[PDB]
Amino acid sequence: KRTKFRKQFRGRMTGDAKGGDYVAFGDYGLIAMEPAWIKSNQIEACRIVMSRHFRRGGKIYIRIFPDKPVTKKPAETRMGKGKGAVEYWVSVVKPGRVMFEVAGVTEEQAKEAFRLAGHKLPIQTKMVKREVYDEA
Amino acid sequence: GKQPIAVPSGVTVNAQDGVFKVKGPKGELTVPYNTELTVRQDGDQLLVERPSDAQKHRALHGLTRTLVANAVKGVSDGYTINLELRGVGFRAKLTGKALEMNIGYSHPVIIEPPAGVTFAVPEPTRIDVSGIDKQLVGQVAANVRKVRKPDAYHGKGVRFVGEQIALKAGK
Amino acid sequence: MELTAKPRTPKQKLDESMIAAVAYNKENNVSFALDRKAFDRAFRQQSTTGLFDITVEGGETFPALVKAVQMDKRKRAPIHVDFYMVTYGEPVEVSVPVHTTGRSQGEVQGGLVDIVVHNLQIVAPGPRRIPQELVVDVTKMNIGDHITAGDIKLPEGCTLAADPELTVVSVLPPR
Amino acid sequence: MKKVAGIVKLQLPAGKATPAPPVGPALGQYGANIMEFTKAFNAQTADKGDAIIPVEITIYADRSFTFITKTPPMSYLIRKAAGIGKGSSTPNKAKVGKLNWDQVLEIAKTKMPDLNAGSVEAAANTVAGTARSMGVTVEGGPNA
Amino acid sequence: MKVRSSVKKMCDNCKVVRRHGRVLVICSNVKHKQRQG
RNA sequence: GGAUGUGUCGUCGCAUAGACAGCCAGGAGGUUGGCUUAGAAGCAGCCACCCUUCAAAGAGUGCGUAAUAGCUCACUGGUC
RNA sequence: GAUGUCGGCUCGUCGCAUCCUGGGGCUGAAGAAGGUCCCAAGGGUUGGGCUGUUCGCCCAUUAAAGCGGCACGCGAGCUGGGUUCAGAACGUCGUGAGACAGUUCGGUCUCUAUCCGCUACGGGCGCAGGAGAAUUGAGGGGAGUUGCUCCUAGUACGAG
């Protein structure tokens, strides 16, 4: 979710994924195929979902934590400077990236934990399995 | 895909043009089709062959056959559906050929069979729509089955004898 | 795998279903360009522990091994491969995966068994005879059993490159 | 009052079927006597008492019912030989108890009317299947 | 009748049909009666 | 986001030694599997998911009851 | 070198995400009464009390007593209650002159319509002679609402 301590603000720009592996931490995985800002709360909205579906195992990984602070309109005006450091925290996610990847549970028993989760994300994804063997 | 074609005696086809004209013991019947829809009789039985094969075609195909085969048992045996009047005081009499419902409506329901159809009643609690054209008959027993559908609590009104009408069941 | 062309230019393939790799050793670093589909159905099987028939156009069979591979983001499709021409006595080292079998005495207990480190790498594989796999015990493993490198039975000869006490598989608890 | 296109099946302790909780509406809403089934139960179960015995009731159209004193359930036979108080919910974590194959011979010999398996052997592996789903284990076996 | 944007099966019946430019859903049971339109 | 609307490429797949859908008929015995409960017996939820017969027929699809029951499925034969 | 401002009144007209009447699916819909989703704007949508009100609360009804748009529709159409002149008061702020989230009593809203548009009504000419009269209908406009009682039937339905 939200980071522990830092600076306070940022900016905005984009271009395809860079350090978003594939297989690791599990057998099955989910992939973000589109530029977006994943809202920390839009992740809980994912974790907590997948959870339910898994009585146990935990084998769910969220390797996308939110390293970013976005701001807001303190009502309207425009006569003042930067504002709302505390609107919410975001996790800029680029294509090909991997936010999810479960492990242990049966294919379908995983081809749902994602399906659902997908339903609360702003972007279009797809699930993945293996053959991932770059660096280790 | 469909091909078999039983063209029993009574018949008489005449693929003359697109009006695939027919004549039998029940009365000459005519059914049009597609021209590029290839068909006629070979040896004894019959068959409707086709040009291309996939959809726009194999459809009309599986259509025509089924259709002609009808006119067969058509002028050959004639068609007749048997309806059932069900419920308290539900009953049909008649008038000449006119089917006469009596199904709870503050005033009686008269139904008149069209140009090639005929009404019949055994016990004023069972019905029948015979005739030549398989369609019309269905296309009318409907109009009779519609004067009153069966209810989801007692399945009243007209229905199809071996009709499966489970009841919601209320209070 | 009959890779044929091998020019700096790939036009005549970038559209036409073909990957594009390079295989070498230190002697010959022949330019290359095989077919998509083939290496596509191929590598899947042998993986990085599977040397194959490399009769480049003209006919010059060569033995090598899938070293590293770089596939596309957005599209799980691969783009560039690097083959490492097989040796004779020693190749370098190989990337070998860990596997389980037999039910775990932890699984039914209430927890699950986790393969901490999927594929594992070992010092000195020994060309000609390189494990295209590696099966490992798990049964014994209960609530908090950790297996490491120093444990996995070796295929007679092979020497474990990774550090011994590093946990390979651990049967995790519930929740 | 009712034909009931179904068969009535239940399991009585030893010789009760008198209180309300046991039967009651089970045969009361049908409009029939029950004080007869009670006396016609403990009288037949006199031989095998102090043990739950399943009985199948067959009601006709003339409000006439019947019964067939069968053999006690395998789920209770184990709780009597091994002295089990109650079935466990986690047979994978903590077991229940342990018995000897000798306690099975008396089951495949008494509950034989129902057993339609092979012969002895085939009628032995079936018993272990039910006990396995309970919690107890099997002693001895092939080899050794 | 159920006009829903997302129309899909709801049991081993639901028979997704296509009548005049519309996506329909006829199931042996009615509460499954769907239709994007 | 939906969806047997078509066009072109790829994957399993399953199969004249006679499948798929349709049809006649079947369907197991243990067991109302134990566990939990006011009970719940293939179907509210923990645990498992084995034995026997067989050509077969799975501690189990979903619908159903206060549980029952009943209705079909997964597996089996003949017709084509 | 001025696009008059809130609210009413008058006058309307349009959208539909329909308030009521029309037709329909499902209902956990017995019937009666409802819920809800679809199709559907022809027409209709009351009178009072409080407030400048819009709004809203309320009295009595109704099939209903829709929501919005048209320079928050309409002041060369009326009002002027509201509020963004001059007087005066209170509280509050200010040493003061004055001020105000404020509150309160008072306070001249301009006869003459040229072009378009609109409602009525004539003159010219045209329609291949000059005249009297009777018509076809291209097209266009108006209207398009609803309750209650009775009958069927105390039936269907319902343990009632």
Curated annotation (Swiss-Prot), chain B:
Keyword Ribonucleoprotein belongs to the record: yes
Keywords, ordered alphabetically: Ribonucleoprotein, Ribosomal protein, RNA-binding, rRNA-binding
SUPFAM superfamilies: Ribosomal protein L6 (SSF56053)
Gene Ontology MF term list: rRNA binding; structural constituent of ribosome
Pfam assignment, any one: Ribosomal_L6
GO cellular component, one term: cytosolic large ribosomal subunit
Lineage: superkingdom: Bacteria
Biological process terms in GO annotation: cytoplasmic translation
InterPro entries documented for this protein: Ribosomal_uL6-like, Ribosomal_uL6-like_a/b-dom_sf, Ribosomal_uL6_a/b-dom, Ribosomal_uL6_bac-type
Role, per record: It is located near the subunit interface in the base of the L7/L12 stalk, and near the tRNA binding site of the peptidyltransferase center. This protein binds to the 23S rRNA, and is important in its secondary structure.
Assembly with partners or alone: Part of the 50S ribosomal subunit.
Annotated family: Belongs to the universal ribosomal protein uL6 family.
Record protein name field: Large ribosomal subunit protein uL6
Annotated source species: Deinococcus radiodurans (strain ATCC 13939 / DSM 20539 / JCM 16871 / CCUG 27074 / LMG 4051 / NBRC 15346 / NCIMB 9279 / VKM B-1422 / R1)
Swiss-Prot record, chain C:
Subunit details: Part of the 50S ribosomal subunit. Contacts proteins L11 and L16, the A site tRNA, and the 5S and 23S rRNAs.
Name the UniProt record assigns to this protein: Large ribosomal subunit protein bL25
Gene Ontology CC: one annotated term: cytosolic large ribosomal subunit
General function of this protein: This is one of 3 proteins that mediate the attachment of the 5S rRNA onto the large ribosomal subunit. This protein has three domains. The N-terminal one is bound on the solvent face, the middle domain fills the space between the 5S rRNA and the L11 arm contacting the 23S rRNA while the C-terminal domain is on the edge of the intersubunit interface and contacts the A site. The protein conformation changes upon binding of a tRNA mimic to the A site, although the mimic does not interact directly with CTC itself, consistent with CTCs presumed role in moderating A site binding.
Transmembrane regions listed in the UniProt entry: none
The keyword Transmembrane helix appears for this protein: no
Molecular function terms, GO-annotated: 5S rRNA binding; structural constituent of ribosome; tRNA binding
Family designation: Belongs to the bacterial ribosomal protein bL25 family. CTC subfamily.
Keyword tRNA-binding carried by entry: yes
One GO BP annotation of this record: translation
Native source organism of the sequence: Deinococcus radiodurans (strain ATCC 13939 / DSM 20539 / JCM 16871 / CCUG 27074 / LMG 4051 / NBRC 15346 / NCIMB 9279 / VKM B-1422 / R1)
Keywords from the UniProt entry: Ribonucleoprotein, Ribosomal protein, RNA-binding, rRNA-binding, tRNA-binding
Region (Middle domain): 105-175
Residue segments, region N-terminal domain: 1-104
Swiss-Prot record, chain D:
A GO CC annotation given for this chain: cytosolic large ribosomal subunit
Leader sequence segment: none
Key words, A-Z: Methylation, Ribonucleoprotein, Ribosomal protein, RNA-binding, rRNA-binding
Pfam family, one: Ribosomal_L11_N
Protein name per UniProt: Large ribosomal subunit protein uL11
Domain of life: Bacteria
Post-translational events: One or more lysine residues are methylated.
Subunit (UniProt): Part of the ribosomal stalk of the 50S ribosomal subunit. Interacts with L10 and the large rRNA to form the base of the stalk. L10 forms an elongated spine to which L12 dimers bind in a sequential fashion forming a multimeric L10(L12)X complex. Contacts the CTC protein (RL25).
Organism: Deinococcus radiodurans (strain ATCC 13939 / DSM 20539 / JCM 16871 / CCUG 27074 / LMG 4051 / NBRC 15346 / NCIMB 9279 / VKM B-1422 / R1)
UniProt-listed InterPro entries: Ribosomal_uL11, Ribosomal_uL11_bac-typ, Ribosomal_uL11_C, Ribosomal_uL11_C_sf, Ribosomal_uL11_CS, Ribosomal_uL11_N, Ribosomal_uL11_N_sf
Residues spanning the membrane: none
Record bears the keyword Iron-sulfur: no
Annotated NCBIfam families: L11_bact
Entry similarity comment: Belongs to the universal ribosomal protein uL11 family.
Residue runs in coiled coils: none
Any single GO BP term: translation
Function as written in the Swiss-Prot or TrEMBL entry: Forms part of the ribosomal stalk which helps the ribosome interact with GTP-bound translation factors.
Entry's Gene Ontology molecular function annotations: large ribosomal subunit rRNA binding; structural constituent of ribosome
UniProtKB/Swiss-Prot annotation, chain E:
Entry note: cofactor: Binds 1 zinc ion per subunit.
One Pfam family this sequence matches: Ribosomal_L36
Gene Ontology cellular-component annotations: cytoplasm; ribonucleoprotein complex; ribosome
Recorded GO MF terms: metal ion binding; rRNA binding; structural constituent of ribosome
InterPro entries: Ribosomal_bL36 (IPR000473), Ribosomal_bL36_sp (IPR035977)
Cofactor(s) named in the record: Zn(2+)
UniProtKB keywords: Metal-binding, Ribonucleoprotein, Ribosomal protein, RNA-binding, rRNA-binding, Zinc
GO biological process: translation
Binding-site positions, Zn(2+): C11, C14, C27, H32
HAMAP family per record: Ribosomal_bL36
Family: Belongs to the bacterial ribosomal protein bL36 family.
NCBIfam families linked: rpmJ_bact (TIGR01022)
Summary of subunit composition and partner proteins: Part of the 50S ribosomal subunit.
Record function comment: Binds the 23S rRNA.
Name listed for the protein in its UniProt record: Large ribosomal subunit protein bL36
Species: Deinococcus radiodurans (strain ATCC 13939 / DSM 20539 / JCM 16871 / CCUG 27074 / LMG 4051 / NBRC 15346 / NCIMB 9279 / VKM B-1422 / R1)
Gene behind the chain: rpmJ
